Point group: C3
Chain length 135, copies 3
């Protein structure tokens, strides 16, 4: 229902897509080949940049399959993609397994991007919650 303008910085990757009609997000690909030794991280390029609509927010989540099979994870999950950010999306992958290295290949689905509305609240300082009227 909502359109998202997306730019394939790396035309060699497939355009991210939604697997089923109600599926929460679209899987992002790795534009590079990387290997993580146990406990090490990396900042991988996905080869895409998005135009998140004002009032919404992009959110990068880890894939559960990999998370369990090989203990693959994202250091700053959920990664926040601001509506204004027009740069390339990057994933902070980390190997949380104790002994087995993870090998990521360019073309691999290494995360998923969800889009949600966000409340751009206005912060209003108060002295106390009682005074304001919130106890």
């Amino acid at each position: 229902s909502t359109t998202l303008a997306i730019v394939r910085l790396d035309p060699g990757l497939p355009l991210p897509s939604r697997a089923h009609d109600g599926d929460a997000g679209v899987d992002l690909y790795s534009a590079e080949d990387v290997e993580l030794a146990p406990g090490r991280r990396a900042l991988v390029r996905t080869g895409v940049a998005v135009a998140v609509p004002f009032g919404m927010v992009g959110l990068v989540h880890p894939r559960s399959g990999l998370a369990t099979r090989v203990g693959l994870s994202i250091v700053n999950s959920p990664g926040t993609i601001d509506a204004g950010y027009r740069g390339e999306i990057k994933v902070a992958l980390i190997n949380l397994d104790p002994a087995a290295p993870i090998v990521v290949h360019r073309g691999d689905r290494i995360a998923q991007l969800l889009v949600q509305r966000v409340e751009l609240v206005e912060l209003v300082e108060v002295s106390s919650f009682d005074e304001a009227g919130l106890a």
Copy 2:
């Protein structure tokens, strides 16, 4: 908005909301597991849900255990698609350096939130300039 839930395992209580405005409901562990420092495990929660179309279920780590024993969830926030009718599982991991964590069946290991999600339609463009979506000053 109601969420149809099936207790695959009838021995566990039905998840519920502690207070009127609470974001989610704590899910239970249907099994007994012990995690060594740095090890993970996929635990069954004894429940399946029917997240409404246009929405998404989100599995978050409980903060109390997160601090006290360093308990966590590898793919947090876990995504539960509206079409998913399987059992909800939690990828627990022990992030503490030396103390093993013991999960007992009946323990509240995570919490389920439900939020609306934008079912976006991706439309590719060669640049953001033509559509007035360029971050000029911010420089991307």
Copy 3:
């Protein structure tokens, strides 16, 4: 936008959290204390603020990506959940995910960011099958 979030600076010594750019998703929270994390160790840090999340909404504590990459800084229970009813101080479960370098956090540093979104306060209805 029109939704306002009541905030109390428990520690007045810190700046009020703010939004950097117009559509930015959250506001950076500060550390009210000095902490140092050896590799693999965690710490519950005070941010010096308490908020009143509107009913039907939820506060979400996210890790900052810069630090996540440069030094492997993370948050154990990310995304931290702040209930609309919670009126206590916001604390961040920081953890050092780097293998060998200690992370040093200074009071005044921006250690996380708070987002606010609406949440569906669903009513669960048990059914024997789908």
